[PDB]
């Protein structure tokens, strides 16, 4: 019934975030399949202007079947709309809601022995703002937009003057969507911080809080500084568009580059907001399946704090080719490099935790180990890109696309799958079938690497970001990348099958702790699922 949606219990809200995150994730992944269909071969075959003359539904179905080039007038606006849609959904309405809204809301109170969040009614409202934001984001795709068509073709970061001059009101709906998301995140961070500080169990000292709870706490602070800044940036876009301001318009004495500083001031912290909870989950999973306590607990907490702090003083590595002086470029380059150090501490600590353990290669552990490998691959290309001299070549190419898909889609997402398999028994009372989880893992591992590794080659060869079509020479690695995406998509549909199976007819969970003694935090002390009212 609609008694799930009106619930104020952190567990129910956690579950709502997870499911909704998953559904929006499916929609955004479906966009990438369409994107990789068009990128699979040079020449435009799918995104034809001719499909506009049909209806919405008829036009949709026609666009899924390839046309000959001679019958296909390239529609760049549709490409730019899908890309912007893919990016907005992921960065605002998918991964953070799942990790922070989902696992954060469900498990952080359990890990600290809190009965519920400080402000349960505020927690429920944070969910509905997320849903309202999502709805506006989706609606913007069907609203009058740029070039006399539907949707905003402006990139997930909304650079002016392009975002300010895009016609129709699709862009305004997108800006409202982002406001709602920021509001949802801010309320969530308020709750996480208050709960964490005030509602710990007697005896639960700061140095006794589990790492996941710490990851969520640090994350919550980043949100409080980052998200208000973003609300400023985007309100300024909204006023330039509607209320005669000219913050970013040179005719009125504005500067488009100012928007970039403000936006990236949110924009870097944003990626550390995505990844910190995944760092939390990896810590719990690895310790459990290595049957060994987490190595260097205190350096981990501090490395997370250090990463959180440094994430606020590096933003202009997104602006090396935007007109930054040599002094700014040198600074931001050196400040960005420092981040490798605490991150290295965490990678090596995770390896040290495994070292001398008794390793059980169950599904959650496979995601966690994939995370270590793939996050390292993404992280070191991040270090390449920090070198302004080399970023001169790589900026706005597919090399950057490869970096961020390794840290996010093969990093944060592996964190999400790690947590789902780790915790689904605890949350539902039902267990996933082990052979299916491993199959899911290997399909995703192979598919995701096939998708993104070849994008390094495309970037090195000079393929720009945000292109509907590309010179013939880029054909080989685009084709491979697209086959990788189709395989990854297959693994995701299989995953959804695994979840559906697990929840409807999965083996009954009977134990409080169905893993082992080294899953040693409070949730494993409770029933599966935990009682409606805990602690």
């Amino acid at each position: 019934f609609t008694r799930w949606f009106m619930s104020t219990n952190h567990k129910d809200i956690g579950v709502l975030y997870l499911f909704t995150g998953g559904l929006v994730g499916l929609i955004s992944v479906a966009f990438t399949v369409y994107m990789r269909m068009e990128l699979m071969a040079p020449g435009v075959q799918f995104m034809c202007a001719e499909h506009l003359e049909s209806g919405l539904v008829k036009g949709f179905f026609q666009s899924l079947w390839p046309s000959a080039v001679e019958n296909c007038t390239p529609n760049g606006h549709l490409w730019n709309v899908m890309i912007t849609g893919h990016g907005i959904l992921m960065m605002f309405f998918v991964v953070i809601p799942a990790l922070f809204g989902g696992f954060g809301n469900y498990f952080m109170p359990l890990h600290i022995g809190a009965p519920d969040m400080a402000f349960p009614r505020m927690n429920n409202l944070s969910y509905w703002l997320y849903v309202a934001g999502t709805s506006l984001a989706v609606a913007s795709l069907f609203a009058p937009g740029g070039n006399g068509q539907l949707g905003s073709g402006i990139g997930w970061v909304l650079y002016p003057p392009l975002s300010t001059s895009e016609s129709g009101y699709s862009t305004d709906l997108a800006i409202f969507a982002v406001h709602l998301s920021g509001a949802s995140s801010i309320l969530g961070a308020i709750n996480m911080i208050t709960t964490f500080l005030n509602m710990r169990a007697p005896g639960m000292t700061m140095h006794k809080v589990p790492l996941f709870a710490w990851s969520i706490f640090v994350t919550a602070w980043l949100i409080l500084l980052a998200l208000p800044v973003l609300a400023g940036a985007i309100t300024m876009l909204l006023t330039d568009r509607n209320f005669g301001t000219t913050f970013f318009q040179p005719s009125g004495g504005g500067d488009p580059v100012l928007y970039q500083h403000i936006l990236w001031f949110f924009g870097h912290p944003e990626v550390y907001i995505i990844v910190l909870p995944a760092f939390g989950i990896v810590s719990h999973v690895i310790a459990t399946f290595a049957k060994k306590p987490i190595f260097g607990y205190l350096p981990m907490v501090y490395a997370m704090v250090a990463i959180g702090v440094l994430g606020f003083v590096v933003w202009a590595h997104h602006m090396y080719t935007a007109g930054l002086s040599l002094t700014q470029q040198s600074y931001f380059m050196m400040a960005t490099m420092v981040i490798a150090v605490p991150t290295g501490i965490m990678i090596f600590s995770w390896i040290a935790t495994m070292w001398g353990g008794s390793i059980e290669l169950k599904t959650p552990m496979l995601w966690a180990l994939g995370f270590l490998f793939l996050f390292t691959v993404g992280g070191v290309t991040g270090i390449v890109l920090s070198q302004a001299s080399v970023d001169r070549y790589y900026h706005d190419t597919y090399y950057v696309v490869a970096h961020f898909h390794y840290v996010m889609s093969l990093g944060a997402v592996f964190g999400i799958f790690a947590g789902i398999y780790f915790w689904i028994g605890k949350m539902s009372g039902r267990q996933y079938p082990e052979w299916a989880g491993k199959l899911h893992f290997w399909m995703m591992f192979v598919g995701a690497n096939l998708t993104f590794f070849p994008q390094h080659f495309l970037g090195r060869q000079g393929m720009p970001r945000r292109y509907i079509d590309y010179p013939e020479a880029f054909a080989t690695w685009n084709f491979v990348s697209s086959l990788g995406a189709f395989l990854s998509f297959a693994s995701f549909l299989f995953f959804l099958g695994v979840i559906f199976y697990t929840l409807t007819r999965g083996a009954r969970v009977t134990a409080n702790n169905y893993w082992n003694e080294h899953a040693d935090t409070l949730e494993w002390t409770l029933t599966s699922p935990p009682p409606e009212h805990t602690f």
């Binding site: 402006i154 488009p256 580059v257 190595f295 007109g323 490998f373 970001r465």
Partner: protein, 256 residues
């Protein structure tokens, strides 16, 4: 002229270098690539070893250690050393790249939706440069018999489609070219991979880059800041030629 600055089928490396800056980029990237491949191979081999050596079937009782001070010192300091080493070779390269020398040739480039305008202020030459196959040349941004014909007529082949423009920026070999870049409407970005240059074209700002081309030939770039519907369809053609061929091209533009 030889087509040099272009992507090649199945390529996995950089585009050929034709400037000393591009050369520096290749070396620095090659140096960092060795390091980061060593780091990730190391990390990967550790994980695979630990999973093999400490599998539950082979190591039935787990250890309990959570510290190893000498190791934590080594693994904090060694990354710091690695980064400082990279920083030492990288900062000179950055300085050379961004310190604008005295120009032999000055070109002012303006980005528009969706084409580039070039002006040579010393020569009182200006012209616009459109993709072969754009609406300007009679097409609609796709390959066709007509577009292939125009590519041939202009000295290219169908393989240069999306790269070749109707007019090129021509410059003399072994001379310092300073390019002043701006945007007319939205932000664009002007780049030539073979020269190791890229500079955003921001409305209201005039920014500079330099290159010195070390061999003659044809070199392509593509707009590198999303700028609307035909972002994919406003490339850059630079022809590097001899001093005499350059003067010849200048005289062809002179109004008597």
């Amino acid at each position: 002229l030889e087509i040099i600055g272009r992507p090649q089928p199945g390529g996995t490396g950089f585009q050929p270098s034709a400037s000393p800056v591009a050369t520096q980029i290749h070396w620095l990237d090659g140096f960092i690539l060795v390091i980061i491949a060593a780091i990730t191979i190391f990390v990967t081999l550790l994980i695979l070893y630990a999973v093999w050596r400490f599998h539950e079937k082979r190591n039935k009782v787990p250890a309990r250690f959570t510290h190893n001070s000498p190791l934590e010192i080594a693994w904090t300091i060694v990354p710091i050393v690695i980064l400082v080493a990279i920083g030492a070779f990288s900062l000179p390269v950055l300085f050379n790249q961004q310190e604008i020398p005295e120009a032999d040739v000055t070109v002012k480039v303006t980005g528009y939706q969706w084409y580039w305008g070039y002006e040579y202020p010393d020569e009182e030459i200006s012209f616009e440069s459109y993709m072969i196959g754009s609406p300007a040349t009679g097409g609609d941004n796709r390959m066709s018999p007509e577009v292939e014909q125009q590519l041939i007529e202009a000295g290219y082949s169908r393989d240069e489609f999306l790269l070749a423009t109707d007019t090129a920026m021509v410059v003399p070999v072994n001379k310092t070219v300073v390019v002043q870049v701006t945007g007319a409407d939205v932000i664009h970005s002007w780049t030539v991979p073979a020269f190791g240059v890229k500079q955003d074209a921001v409305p209201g700002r005039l920014a500079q880059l330099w290159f010195r081309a070390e061999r003659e030939g044809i070199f392509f770039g593509q707009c590198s800041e999303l700028c609307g519907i035909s972002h994919a369809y406003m490339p850059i053609t630079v022809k590097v030629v001899s001093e005499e061929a350059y003067a010849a091209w200048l005289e062809q533009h002179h109004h008597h």
